[PDB]
Design a protein around this ligand. Structure first.
Ligand SMILES: CCCCCCCCCCCCCC(=O)O
Ligand SMILES: CCCCCCCCCCCCCC(=O)O
Ligand SMILES: [Fe+3]
Ligand SMILES: [Mn+2]
Ligand SMILES: [Mn+2]
Lengths: 309, 310
């Protein structure tokens, strides 16, 4: 079924290309889960109330279940790239998939360190919107790539995975861990965990930005494809946040505000249009070798850290 | 399409399971391609004959094409595990796949560091047996898993990928690099590269052993499946080595002996049979949590180093 090898081509691999830059950067930024000290977090964990632990278990459950979902649901995109003959994108997606496995590993290591061994499916039960995104929308949109690796489907898939799950919901998730851990000077492991995954997640967001950009740049009809999926998904994501808060009667532990999160989340969502729009008109041959989507993600992380202080 | 999350299960993930054990140690044994010093290599590379550089370029072309092939052809196996619902296997295979991309990366780094920018396809022209393994058997057998994730097909895929490509063809290639570099005290980059990817390869073969083992333990018909595939592939694998030597008149550069490599390859090939057969009769529940496929791969690698002192 194979007739040729990308790595045997003239000039070889293009080290300037966006997906290879991200790949090189993931190698330089690699971290070990065994290096995270978890030996302090159980002491903190027990000094919390029955209600504080309920929220934190429910957030961790949404995380690890979401981490697992992405480790699985990225394979079709890898398959699409193999089919499309894009070796650089393909190689990066291996690192992508591996990174998601490592996040799934490390959240499981935290649950074990705080001594949670019971079945956790019940924490997603009161969250019908969570399951709509992670058991339904994420895999169905991504698996559609196996039948239809069309530019339109790749955008719809990227929007769903990269821009909403990672770009909007995960960042919102991290903000929740900031409010829980940093403000109350607790759970140093979870903090180091959230830092380290946050780091990996930035190359992921960069990649989603790259993918949507190159498609928009080549055929401007795809902008509308991007727009529409974003518009379907934002209300669903906001809904997830509301349900999490409504469970605690809008007045939750850790002094968390419903409207604070809704404003914080929307900001992460809308900011995605800006990432993609500047590709309209630009030539594809520049989008390939353009590092900016990774830069944008650095300055986004920068702006986020500034906002906290 | 998803109804449950494996990581939310009671007891969580089984850290004792073989695929998670390899993942853990993959993390610990992670290496950076940017740590490998390639500077010294172009100095040695230019002090070689034309006949020497040809063989070395032909071996590297076969390697870097082989690495790329495995990076592509393993995605179906991931899909199979996703379908069979085996999370520990999935997780490991993501690291597996990533490793292959990093080997592809690092061979290309080498080719750059020595000054090779020409199209390298012309080096697989005279190797029809290479193109049969890597452009036909490997993808066609592995892509079969997307339509048919059955035990039989998984055994057939693992035999192709892990037991022959990795277990027999890759180790023979490493041996070639040993006889080329270590013996002639040249190419310290290629050397560091070869032992570093070798470290990864051992976990890949360990997984290959685990996969075939758990299928044979559960159904003894899968032994015959294993046996049949191995018997198909071995001849083709020796063919590859014979074609590669016959290009240099059986008398190639670096003083490489054809019969030496056939006997060396054969040994790597046959040892695979013994790796899987001891699972016959054994309980499947034991194999899931048994680390010996990774131990065996360590004692094999140790046995190989020892052989070299001769
Ligand atoms: C009320 C708190 C809202 C927090 C949202 C739930 C957290 C979901 C985690 C998102 C999954 C991350 C996937 C990834 O690693 O890219
Ligand atoms: C002339 C001697 C023949 C040398 C054997 C060709 C090289 C084997 C292909 C490399 C396969 C690598 C697969 C892997 O890294 O898992
Ligand atoms: Fe390998
Ligand atoms: Mn992640
Ligand atoms: Mn390899």
């Amino acid at each position: 079924t194979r007739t040729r090898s990308g790595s045997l081509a003239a000039g070889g691999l293009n080290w300037a290309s966006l997906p290879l830059k991200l790949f090189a950067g993931g190698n330089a930024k690699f971290w070990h889960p065994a290096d995270i000290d978890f030996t302090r977090d159980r002491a903190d964990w027990e000094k919390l109330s029955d209600d504080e632990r309920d929220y934190a278990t429910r957030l961790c459950t949404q995380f690890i279940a979401g981490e697992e979902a992405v480790t699985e649901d990225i394979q079709p995109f890898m398959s699409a790239m193999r089919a499309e003959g894009r070796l650089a994108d393909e190689m990066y997606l291996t690192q992508f998939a591996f990174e998601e496995a490592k996040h799934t590993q490390v959240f499981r290591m935290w649950l074990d360190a705080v001594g949670i061994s019971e079945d956790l499916h019940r924490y997603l039960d009161d969250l019908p919107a969570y399951r709509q995104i992670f058991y339904a929308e994420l895999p169905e949109c991504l698996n559609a790539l196996s039948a239809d690796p069309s530019p339109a489907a790749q955008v719809r898939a990227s929007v769903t995975y990269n821009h909403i799950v990672e770009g909007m919901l995960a960042l919102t998730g991290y903000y929740a861990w900031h409010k829980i851990c940093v403000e109350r000077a607790i759970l140093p492991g979870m903090q180091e965990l959230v830092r380290r995954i946050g780091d990996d997640e930035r190359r992921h967001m960069a990649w989603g930005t790259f993918t949507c950009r190159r498609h928009v740049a080549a055929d401007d009809a795809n902008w509308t494809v991007f727009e529409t999926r974003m518009n379907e998904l934002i209300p669903l994501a906001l809904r997830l946040i509301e349900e999490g808060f409504a469970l605690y009667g809008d007045q939750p532990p850790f002094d968390l505000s419903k409207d604070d999160f809704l404003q914080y989340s929307t900001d992460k969502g809308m900011r995605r249009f800006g990432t993609i729009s500047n590709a309209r008109g630009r030539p594809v041959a520049e989008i390939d070798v353009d590092y900016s989507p990774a830069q944008l993600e650095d300055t986004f992380a920068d702006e986020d850290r500034r906002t906290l202080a």
